[PDB]
Structures are given as C-alpha cells and as structure tokens.
Design a protein around this ligand. Structure first.
Ligand SMILES: [Zn+2]
Ligand SMILES: [Zn+2]
Ligand SMILES: [Zn+2]
Lengths: 1082, 47, 47, 96, 48, 48
C-alpha cells in the first residue's frame, strides 16, 4: 500500500514511489540524479512508463510493519517488465530486476528496522531490447511498460524450500526414463507430499520436506551436498552471464547491463559460498571500472577469493573469421594485459561460446598468447553436420593445439533443471574419450546471469545424485581451468583425445560474411591503416629524437577497433542504432590513425602532397615489407602517375621514363579489348568478359564452354536471398536456385592510355538499384607489379532480400581452392561430395581466393569482401546483401567494391600473396619536407629470403623500447629468412610470443652495416621477434622450452610449471589469483 | 547422346530439413510475403 | 606444462560399432583364440 | 494381456489376501548377466508402489541350479553398482 | 597426401577430422605416395 | 514451384499449377476427382 492509505496508524507499513523521468533518451548516472533532480511525481502499481530505451528513476521509501519484527527475511518485489538495478542511498548497486525472472530484492537486515529508502534505475527495454513483434525484428521505438509489482513480501522460507524440492522431484518424474525406478520413487514421494500438505497447517510444510528428504537427502540446505562424492564428478557447473557488448541495444545500455549483472552475481556469491561465476570480455571490466570504480574494487576482491573468475583473455568476444590475424593477436594482447594489470591473473582458457565460426589459426594464436584451452558451444547450431566430438584437440594450420570442450548441453545459458544436468553428460559426443561435461548456467545472450533459484536447483540435483543416484554427480566449486585440468589428467595430457585439424566450420550464419558491407570495408581499411601508423611511428620514435611512440593514442585506437570486432557487430547482425554508433567510431579511428601516421611522417622528414608541389618530386609511401617495383596512382582528379623504386622499398619516386609494357584499350567487332604485355581481356558490349587470354602462356583462362555459365566472366547475378530464420545472419544453400543475371549493361572506353586502360560498364540492377563497373588493365615495367584485371564497382544498392554476386568461370580443374585466412591458407573443397562439403557452399576468406591446378591458377583479390565460393570451375565473390530483419536499411546506399582477377602460370605462390597485399595497400603521396632530413630510413627493418615469409607487422613493445616484428609463413612450408636491421645498433634479438615475452635468444650477425638475424619458420608458423636496440618432458608455461634444470610447480592447479629464469622474472601469472609455487629438482 | 561427357558443376545432395522448412515461406504472410504467393492473392483490394 | 604445443599425430574418433564388436574376440575361442585370453586359461591340461 | 502389477495383494473369494510378487525379469532360471539384474528392477510393472525386484537365478525347468560362474557375475554386478552406479544395487544374502 | 592411382593422382586427407577421414586409415596407391608441403616433399616409391 | 513462381509474372502461377498436376492429377478443379476409383474408398467424408 502507499503511505496515503496509512495515516491514522504508524504500524502497518507502506511503499512509496517517486518517479523522476529522464527528459531525453539519455542514461544519467546515480550521482547526476540522486541529490540533483527532484523526485516529485508519484508512481503506483499499474502505471505506464516511457517509450523504448527511456530511463526512469524511482525513489522507494518503505516502512515495514512492526508485526514484521519476526520474518527473518523480507523481500521487496519489483516487476516492471524491464531492467532494474536497485541502488542504495550511497549509490551502491545492489540488485538487478529483469522482468519476472528476477523480481526479488532481499532487504539487507540493516534497514528493515529503520524506515529507509533506496533507488531503482528502470530502463524501458526488455532483456533483448524492444523487438517489434519478434526478438530480432527491428526495434519498436514506442514500447510502453507497466509496473505490476512494487510490493514488500516476507516470504515463507520453508514453503519456498519445499517448492524447490518438489520442483526438482517433479522434473525427475517428467524427465527420467519410463523404466527408471527413481522416476517412480520421485512420483510416489511427490504424491505423498500433496496428500500431506494442508494450506491451513504450516507444519505440513515441514513434514513434506521430511518426506522429500528420502529422495534429496539431508544436505540440500547448504553447500555440504557438494562435499559428498566430490571426487568422481561427471558434470561441472559454472555460473555465466553472456552480455553482448552490442547486439540489440546500444553500447550505453550494455554499460548498465554489465553492472546490474555483476552486482547481482556478487550478492549471490555472498549468499552461496560454493558458487562461481565466469565472465570473459576485458572491455566490459574496463567499462565497469570507468563507470563504477567501487564496484570494481569489490569485484577484484571477489576475483581474489576465486569466486568471479575472469576468463577468455580477450578484449571482446570477437568474431574470428573477419578480422585479420594481427587483430586476433591484439584481442589477446589487450585482454591479457588488462587482466594481468587489474588482477594478477592470466587467462588460460579462450572463452568464445557465441562466435560464428573459428578460423584455422586460432589454436596457434591461443598458444602464442598463453592459452591452451578453448571453450565454445556455437558449433551445436550446425544444421547439417553434428560436430563429431565434445572434447577434442583442435590443431591449427601449423600444428599448434589447444584442448577444446563444447558443453554437451548445447547452451551457455542453461537453467540447472534435471534435463540440463542430465544432458551435460548424456549428449556428450565422444564419451569414450572422457566422461566430463561442463554445465554453463545463467541467463545470457545479453543480460544478467544465474538466479538463486538455479543454485537451489543445483544443490537439489546434487542431493538427488547423492541419494538415489540417477542424475550425474555434479560439482559446483570448480573453475573452468580445473575442469580442463581434470580432462588433461584423465586423458594423458590430452594425447588420447580425438583431433580436429584446421578450421572449425560453422554451418550457419554465412550471410555474416557479407552483411554490413560498410563496416567490413572500414574494418579492413582500419586494420591496414593501424599497421601503417604503427610502422611509421616505430620508425619515427627510432630515428627522431623529439618523437615519442604514441602508446596511449594507439591503445585507444586499438581499443575502439577491437570493440567493433565483437562477434555480433562485425558480422553485421545488430540493430540499426548499433551501427549508427559503430560506423562513426570506425571512421573516427580511421581519421585519427591517419593523423597519427602523418605526425610520424612529419617527424621522419616528409609531408602530405598538398597538391601544389610539382610531380617530379612526389614520393609514395609503401609500408609493405618488400619492393613494390611500381605503383600507378592518381594525383589529380584524373591524372595517373607511375611511381617506381629501384632499390629502396619504403619510398617510391615518380617515374620519368614511359612503361616498358604499356596497357591499351581499343575496340573490335562491337567488342572492347584491354590489352597488356601479359593479358588480353575481351569484353562484350554487354559488359561480360568474353575472353581472358594469357599472352605469355598462350592459353585461354575462362572456359565458357563447360559449366552453367556460358556468357562471359565477371557476370553479376542477383540471387533471391530469403533465408530461413535470421535475415542478417543467414544465407541458405537454396538461395542459388532463384536468380536474375544482370546482362543489360553498356560498355564505354574510360581510358586507353599507357599507364591504365579501362572500360566502364553501366549495369542496371533494377529500378532503384544501379551499378557502374570499371574494368581496368595497368601497364608495367616488371611483372611483379601486376595485380591482374581490376574491377571497381560503384553500386547504388536499394534491393530487398537480394544477394548480388559476381562469377568467373576459370578453366581450372582442382578438388580444392585456397583461401587466404588469418596468417595462412585454408583449403576448401570444390565438389559437394559429402554433407560436410555441402555445408561449405559459401566460405570466408581474407584478401584472396585462389583456384589453381598443377600448371595454372586464378586468384580473386579483393579489398573489402569476405564471402567466396569456388565449386567446379566457377569462382563467385559475394558482393552485397539486403537483409531487413535486425536492420531494415542494412546495406542500402552507395558502395565501392574493388576486386581483381589475377591469373598466374603455376600453383598458388607468393606472387598472389604479394599482389593481394598490394591490392589492399594505401599508397600515400608524400613530399620531402627538406633535403637535409629526407633520408629513406624506411628500409630499417627488412625480411630477406623465401618470399612466402611475410614481415606482417612492425611495432614497439608495450613494456619497453624494443621493436616487435611479426613474421609468418604464408603458404605452408618450412622456410628460411633473415631479418636485416640496417641503420641501427642492435643490442639483441629474441624470439618472443604474442604477449611479447621472450622465448629464446637468437644469434644476430654483424655485416658491413646491418645485423642479419637468420630465422626459420615452420609450415604456417607465426613468429614474433623482439629487437632490443642500443649498445648493451615438462615445459615452462611462459617460455615453451623443455625444463632441464629445476622448475617451479604451482600447487594451486595441475599443469603450470615455470622455469627458474621465468620464476625470477615473476612471469608466472595464470588462472590462479594466489599461486603457490613449490620447487622441483632434476 | 544428351548426357554430357564433362561435369564441371557439382551438385550437392539436398539437406532434408533445410529444403523442407523452405517450403513454409511460399504461403507465409511474414517477412518474405512480398516475394511469395500471398503477394498476388488480391488483385487490388479496396476498403 | 605437460600439454605439448605441437600435435602431429591425428587421433580419430572411435567408430562405435567397430570398437564394440572388437570386444567379442577377447574371450572368443575362435580364429583369434591364440592371441586372446582363452589361450592362457589352462596351465597345461592333461588328458 | 500383460498382468498389471509385479507386487500386489492377491485376494481370495472370501477376502483372504496374500502378498504376491512376480519377479520382473520374467524367469526363475535367470543367468545373472547385467540384463537379468537390470530387468529385475526396470521391468517391474508397478514401480510406484515398490522398487524391489526378486532375481531368481539358476538353471531349471528340470535340472541343476546355479553355477559358480553366475555367482562371480553377481559379485561383479554388485561391484559395478558400487563403483560406477548404473546397475541396480543387488543383494545376495537375503532370503525370499 | 598425393597417391598415384590409375592415370593420375588421388588426394587423401591426413587428419582424421570426420568419419569420412577416419575411414581412410589405409589407402590404395599404385607406385608412389607423396607427402609435400609448399617447399618440400617426400615420395615413397614402391615396386610391389 | 518456388523456383518457378515470380510475383511480377502472373503466368508463372499457371505453370506452377501445371507442375503441381504431376502430383495432384488433372481433375482437382471439379468434382470429377471423386468419379475415379470411386468403388474402393477407404475414407468417407461427410460435412458436419
Ligand atoms: Zn552473443
Ligand atoms: Zn596455478
Ligand atoms: Zn621460462
């Protein structure tokens, strides 16, 4: 009742609600509201609050009746079908509310006696945003919410305990097999409980609980249940709350979801001592620390108490298909550094239960970044092939392995019903190898984690297992790392587990390779720009005395970039407001990265071209780790200039001489010919490439005679998309059965000059949708600067449920195609033989897809696209989608798509890799600021040797002033190279890992003026080298070297041994907040 | 003969569940209503 | 750690039927009797 | 017709009653394999009333009873129930 | 791995990923079996 | 029928019906369907 109902009597209590309404859709903090704004309007049950995403603050003044001096527990119940977050008067978040699934707030025994007040920060959105009819439909901006409960309750604790008992027993009745005697024992006991209970006699509750003891045992009331049979557990339960950093709500709402989940979990930890909770993303910890520093202090105390286990080791729970390899390394680097700085923990388990597909080098990147365990459950959504195993060894391209478990109950948001506990062991897919399942329980997919009801049900499941013994022995007080320790101990360090080699293909959400094209183009541009900026910043800090490496600015830019690689934002499956946030911050990252790069360049003695200096002194910045012998770039709106570099690779100078092999564009019998020294492209007036003739090897490349495609290559096709359920996520295999070929274009010669010949195709996609395709051939001096036939498509895209793709039939016969993925090549079948191959009708690739036979091959390079399909002589690049369901204007607008067809006269080799890198490069026009500091130091760090070894990244170390060089084998063979460090005094060069921790010392030579460290890489190895400048069967878990001398073994866990040197270095952080190391000899 | 000698166009075996649940959207009045049969039921309804 | 970094020895998931029917020949007195348990039942029978 | 119950009260014409059990593994010449032990409880027809089954093992229908092999198998069934606990808890030293 | 078969090469997996690959624990080849990466390879030739 | 139907072309409806004739026969448009095999019926339908 309100206080207005009680005036004559000061004894019967009340609940008074004053509501303050935030004017805009903003989300003010507690200190910006309480004490400043006026709580004047009165709210009551049945009231209606605000449009979608609106925030309301409630001052709740309660008076407990003194007749409640008894009632050892008093509950405040709050049910407005939206978000909660009780705040104390001092601003401390105490308890969240989430619709009807979480409504109770236990008064903390301190203000039951005193007539006190608190606050509730209501958010006018559901657990999953608004939705407008369906969960993944676009948000409804005019949703209104009704307050249905604002009551004070004094719950009957024995009655609720009996309710939990009966619920578990009734679930046993409903779920257990019909011939299981425990099912009938439970039914018999439940029937007696009904026959015994009388609502008018409260002792019947106690004797009903006594009756239930025959099925649940006597220990279910505390954590003593888990202390019985606790040596042979089959199911390991861990609390979890998956909060999508942005899926169907803005980042600003994620910020509140984080705190209201974690404060709730911390109070639950207070009440349940055996309960443990894992949460992954380091960015969410950073957001909590920024918003609620005191909650963060309490949180780190909980982390010390081994409750509240941080896991994953990455900045966000990112997609692993779209971001480039350095982005994955950065995810781990930033996450692990944050966890090592705020806590003393280094994660050992890569936690990624919601990512759409797993690229083939993830196990190697994990091992390089200190994690040998992998947890995921998304592969259970494979709608063609069930993944063979639940616990296995996942092996990268290079051979690096992590141990992966997929929770057999195919969720990370389980409910701790008997079905969840049972399925955690009984739908384990390779039970012959291990009989341990992980039960990940909570409420997630963006929200707030487990409830106390789930912990009660877990205790009762354990009691049932102890007493009548059909349910699995479930353990609650173990961490995920202890679960993996058990698996490794039982399986002989994982040797007996089945292996999976290569990419874990997700047979679902394939449309995520293409949807949100603007964000994906921006992601690739930003990754390349960050690489260039870090490279020139390293050079400027090395060679300029008055330039400091911008660690802070680079860290901010990388934090934003890695935030946008979240496993729902980057794949393109968010509401429109998420992208109205993400695209601008990505553009800001690009702009600030360019500013940083230009500051470094100015420190190096150059400046932007400024379009006033004469052409003969224009330079070009390369930033690729090899000589791009020549680049053709525009200087004015239409003036093309050829830049060449004879020896120095960093800077290219404008060329005087004409090209040795110019390109030409002429006409024929209504056909257009783009001709080179290397290629002849015959284009129909339709725009289709009728012929692609290699002139050196006098062979046709197209094969229009076989296959379904008989009318030219570069054929644009508009498929009807209409996926089954998730429009932005999914494309179906039947989408290729209904299509329209776009063959109404008109061709004109755009240019025929020596530097670049080019025609223009004007293709009408439909009404409201148009596209202009430019097909170009460039002249060259050397064949190594050729990138093939270039295509630039400008698309006004306004289709609905359409998928624009481009096809090239290519006269290649091979059973596999090579797709460039992070740090190497993934080979995919081209034949649809089995259901595994049928599932791969569209695949993800980074920058090129190669289709080669023994004598010839064709690569398709791209600068913004990630979806490809090679099946039987037909190469198809996915260009544009038009989904509607989460975002009704997903890709509508203008798009610039660049891709190249690069034919080569051998199997795939380093020429394609270099051509793809060059195709994706941003060559920047420079001008010498002077001639006294115009030295070309851009060749300070070189890699000399087998061209399949790529010096992919140059960086300064996070800790010191050493230079970090990322090197990788790109094509899959053990290769030898040398790092040449020219204008520098090298104190030492070491091989280190992804976290930049030294692994071994390398022998650096001393030549006339450089240093020449020889290196050897395995087939697909990612190596990291730390250059320190100046003048100067047990392996260690930090430096992966066999420990021959004494070691230090952590007793807190099972599989952490550190060597003496790393022990002295204090480099032994791992998932043990309080590690205890004992010395081991021999 | 009409049977071609060379096959450069692999055809996959249809997945039962996917192609069976595709059938539901031909008469569905939901998201893809505009691309399927219910879009041509009417001939210019007047109200 | 005991978990090796490199895995160059693929392990297959055991086929249920094959490995279950392998169990029948440990106590079988048939063709493979000489390689399994029934070969060592006796300790020099005399008749 | 399958008889409805495994354990019941059988009442005569006059009202006199005995308590009748029909061994759920439908034999009196069982073999003490895990199937016999399992069926002794899991094809009990009225398990809601009682969850006890009698396992009558031996070789019969005219002949000679249980073999020592059956007692070894019974001991191992009990050991399995003690250790990994899927088989029913079987008792051997009790009279009918 | 590349196995010489009648009039050409059959490529077989080396990884046991799926049950299709598990089934191929022993395979037939005519006169050589080749195991090559990008930079190096080893052939086993035989005559019987 | 799905691969054939285009909402912008109304003759696709007629050819979709022709496709369905391979499963439903040619008599479904009238009461002539019931005049075939009408001596060995197993199900007798009556409105109610
Ligand atoms: Zn998610
Ligand atoms: Zn430890
Ligand atoms: Zn070490």
């Amino acid at each position: 009742n309100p206080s207005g109902d009680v005036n004559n009597d000061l004894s019967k209590g009340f609940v008074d609600l004053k509501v303050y309404r935030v004017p805009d859709l903003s989300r003010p903090s507690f200190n910006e509201v309480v004490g400043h704004k006026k709580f004047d309007e009165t709210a009551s049950k049945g009231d209606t609050f605000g449009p979608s995403w609106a925030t309301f603050w409630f001052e709740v003044h309660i008076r407990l009746p003194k007749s409640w001096a008894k009632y050892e527990q008093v509950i405040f119940q709050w049910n407005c079908d939206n978000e909660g977050l009780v705040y104390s008067q001092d601003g401390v978040p105490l308890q969240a509310f989430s619709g009807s699934e979480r409504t109770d707030f236990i008064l903390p025994d301190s203000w039951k006696t005193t007539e006190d007040t608190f606050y509730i920060e209501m958010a006018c959105n559901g657990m999953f945003g608004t939705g407008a009819g369906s969960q993944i439909a676009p948000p409804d901006p005019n949703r209104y919410f009704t307050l249905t409960k604002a009551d004070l309750v004094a719950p009957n604790l024995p009655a609720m305990a009996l309710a939990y008992d009966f619920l578990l027993m009734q679930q046993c009745v409903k779920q257990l097999p019909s011939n299981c005697w425990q099912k009938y024992k439970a039914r018999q006991i439940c029937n007696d409980i009904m026959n015994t209970f009388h609502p008018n006699d409260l002792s019947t509750i106690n004797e009903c609980r006594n009756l239930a003891k025959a099925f649940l045992g006597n220990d279910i009331d505390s954590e003593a249940v888990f202390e019985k049979n606790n040596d042979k557990a089959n199911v390991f339960a861990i609390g979890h709350c998956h909060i999508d950093t942005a899926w169907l709500w803005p980042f600003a709402e994620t910020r509140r979801k984080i705190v209201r989940s974690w404060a709730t979990q911390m109070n639950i930890m207070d009440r349940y001592p055996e309960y443990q909770f894992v949460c992954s993303q380091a960015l969410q910890y950073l957001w909590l620390k920024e918003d609620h520093p005191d909650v963060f202090e309490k949180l780190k105390e909980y982390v010390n108490q081994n409750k509240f286990i941080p896991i994953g080791g990455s900045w966000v729970e990112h997609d692993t298909n779209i971001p480039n390899g350095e982005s994955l390394i950065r995810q781990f680097l930033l996450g692990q550094h944050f966890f090592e700085k705020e806590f003393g923990v280094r994660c050992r388990t890569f936690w990624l239960p919601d990512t759409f597909g797993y690229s083939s080098q993830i196990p190697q990147i994990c091992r390089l970044c200190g994690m040998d365990r992998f947890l995921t459950q998304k592969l259970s959504w494979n709608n063609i092939n069930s993944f063979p195993t639940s616990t296995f060894n996942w092996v990268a391209l290079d051979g690096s392995q992590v141990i992966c478990h997929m929770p057999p109950a195919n969720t990370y948001t389980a409910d701790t019903n008997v079905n969840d506990v049972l399925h955690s062991i009984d739908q384990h897919k390779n039970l012959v190898n291990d009989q341990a399942g992980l039960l990940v329980f909570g409420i997630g997919d963006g929200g707030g984690g487990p409830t106390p009801e789930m912990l009660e049900k877990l205790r009762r499941c354990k009691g049932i297992a102890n007493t009548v013994g059909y349910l699995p022995n479930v353990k609650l007080g173990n961490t995920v790392d202890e679960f993996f320790d058990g698996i490794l101990k039982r399986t002989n360090a994982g040797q007996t587990l089945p292996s999976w080699n290569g990419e874990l293909y997700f047979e679902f959400h394939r449309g995520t390779y293409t949807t949100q094209a603007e964000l994906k183009k921006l992601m690739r541009k930003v990754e390349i720009a960050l690489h260039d900026a870090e490279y020139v910043s390293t050079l400027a800090s090395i060679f300029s005395k008055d330039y400091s490496y911008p660690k802070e600015s680079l860290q901010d830019l990388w934090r934003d970039t890695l935030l946008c690689q979240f496993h729902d934002v980057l794949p393109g499956s968010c509401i429109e407001m998420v992208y109205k946030d993400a695209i601008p911050i990505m553009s800001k990252v690009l702009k600030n990265t360019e500013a940083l790069l230009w500051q470094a360049i100015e420190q190096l003695g150059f400046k932007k071209a400024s379009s006033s200096d004469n052409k003969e002194q224009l330079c070009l910045l390369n930033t690729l780790p090899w000589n791009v012998r020549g680049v053709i770039t525009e200087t004015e709106e239409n003036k093309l200039v050829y830049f060449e570099s004879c020896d120095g690779k960093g800077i290219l100078t404008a060329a005087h001489t004409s090209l040795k092999h110019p390109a030409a564009a002429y006409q024929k019998d209504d056909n257009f010919i783009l001709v080179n020294d290397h290629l002849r492209v015959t284009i129909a007036p339709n725009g289709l490439i009728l012929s692609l003739f290699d002139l050196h090897k006098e062979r046709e490349i197209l094969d229009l005679k076989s296959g379904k495609n008989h009318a030219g290559a570069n054929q644009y096709v508009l498929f009807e998309d209409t996926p089954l359920s998730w429009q932005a996520w999914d494309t179906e295999v039947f989408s290729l059965e209904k299509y329209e070929v776009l063959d109404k274009g008109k061709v004109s010669i755009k240019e025929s000059g020596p530097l670049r010949a080019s025609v223009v195709v004007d293709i009408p996609i439909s009404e409201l949708s148009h596209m202009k395709a430019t097909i170009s051939l460039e002249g060259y001096n050397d064949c190594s600067e050729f990138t093939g036939v270039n295509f630039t498509c400008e698309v006004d895209w306004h289709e609905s449920c359409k998928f624009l793709k481009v096809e090239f039939p290519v006269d290649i016969h091979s059973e596999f195609a090579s797709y460039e993925t992070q740090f190497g090549i993934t080979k995919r079948p081209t034949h649809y033989n089995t259901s595994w191959d049928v599932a791969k009708f569209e695949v993800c690739h980074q920058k090129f897809a190669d289709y080669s036979d023994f004598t010839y091959g064709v690569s398709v390079l791209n600068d913004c696209k990630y979806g490809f399909s090679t099946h039987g002589n037909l190469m198809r690049l996915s260009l544009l989608r038009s989904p509607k369901q989460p975002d009704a204007h997903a890709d509508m607008g203008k798009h610039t798509i660049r891709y190249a067809v690069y034919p080569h006269s051998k199997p795939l080799d380093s020429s394609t890799v270099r051509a793809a890198h060059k195709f994706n490069s941003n060559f920047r026009l420079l001008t010498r600021a002077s001639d006294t500091a115009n030295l070309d130091i851009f060749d300070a760090f070189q890699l000399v040797g087998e061209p399949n070894v790529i010096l992919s990244h140059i960086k300064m170390a996070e800790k010191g002033k050493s230079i970090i060089l990322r090197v990788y084998e790109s094509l899959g063979g053990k290769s030898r190279a040398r790092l040449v460090i020219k204008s520098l005094t090298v104190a030492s060069v070491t091989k280190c890992n992804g976290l930049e921790e030294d692994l071994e010392e390398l022998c650096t030579l001393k030549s006339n003026d450089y240093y020449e460290v020889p290196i050897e890489l395995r087939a697909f190895e990612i190596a990291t080298f730390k250059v320190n400048l100046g003048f100067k069967s047990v392996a260690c878990n930090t430096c992966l070297k066999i420990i021959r001398n004494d070691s230090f073994h952590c007793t807190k866990c099972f599989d952490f041994d550190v060597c003496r040197d790393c022990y002295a270095k204090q480099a032994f952080l791992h998932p043990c907040p309080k590690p205890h190391f004992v010395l081991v000899r021999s | 003969t009409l049977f071609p000698v060379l096959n450069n166009t692999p055809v996959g075996k249809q997945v039962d569940s996917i192609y069976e649940s595709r059938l539901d959207q031909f008469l569905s009045e939901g998201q893809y209503r505009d691309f399927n049969l219910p879009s041509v039921y009417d001939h210019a309804r007047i109200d």
